[PDB]
Amino acid sequence: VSMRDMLKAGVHFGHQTRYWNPKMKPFIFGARNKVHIINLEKTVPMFNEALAELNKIASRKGKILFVGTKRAASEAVKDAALSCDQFFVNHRWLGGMLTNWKTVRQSIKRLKDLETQSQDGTFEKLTKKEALMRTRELEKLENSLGGIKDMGGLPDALFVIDADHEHIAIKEANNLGIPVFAIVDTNSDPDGVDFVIPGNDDAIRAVTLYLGAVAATVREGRSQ
RNA sequence: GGCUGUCGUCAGCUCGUGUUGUGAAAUGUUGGGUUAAGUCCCGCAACGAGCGCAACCCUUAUCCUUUGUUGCCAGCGGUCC
Ligand SMILES: [Mg+2]
Ligand SMILES: [Mg+2]
Ligand SMILES: [Mg+2]
Ligand SMILES: [Mg+2]
Ligand SMILES: [Mg+2]
Ligand SMILES: [Mg+2]
What protein family is recorded (predicted)? Predict the structure, then answer.
């Protein structure tokens, strides 16, 4: 990544001054038009070091998970995870995914069974009434947990967009002792994150830049 | 002990794991619609399950296949009708 490359993507833009958490005063360069500006000169090295640690942990062959739930970036996180060979969650995070995994395993199994029934030639003996509810259940289950259908255990690293919106996941990770790699805007609390990446978290361009950089770095980490 | 009345055939009553609180406890079971119904859908720190509601049981209302006695008489013949 480069300062020139990411300055054109509008990363430095933050939120309104009325909303800034004081927990990240150092990360703010200044203000303009009553809107904060994020400092590039420090967000570059921390991002690079996070990427280094990330592909280092990837080379150990460790599964990782991408949390991004805004309706404007579900497609981007899905694309990164798919062309990453790694996993994702792109809808409402069901509380207790990590800390209550021994229960969500059952829903994973049910989704697998129902997918086999659907794409195995079974949804024709049903009397056009319960087949529809089976399809409805399929759609709900895949939209809620389709990106984690093959954990086979807890992950190792958990990557989050907009740490503030995803406090449940960060708390899950802190409870279970799993490192967190998150992007925080000028209104979040970075205490639960041990690898803080300052910057915007809602603009599509910045989100795409983050996801592309992470997907690349982890591909070269896996190829190692 | 067993059996029965009653609230009341009212729509409610709970549990496992997770989270919150020093604790008694809370959540789920709250919210928007909807229903005869905690009935269903959408949201959601909750994710699921059990007993209840509904369906499976008996009867009544239409049609068809089979058998025609002690039951029936449309078309035939006779008749004390
Ligand atoms: Mg406690
Ligand atoms: Mg509450
Ligand atoms: Mg209650
Ligand atoms: Mg309660
Ligand atoms: Mg409701
Ligand atoms: Mg029910």
Answer: Belongs to the universal ribosomal protein uS2 family.
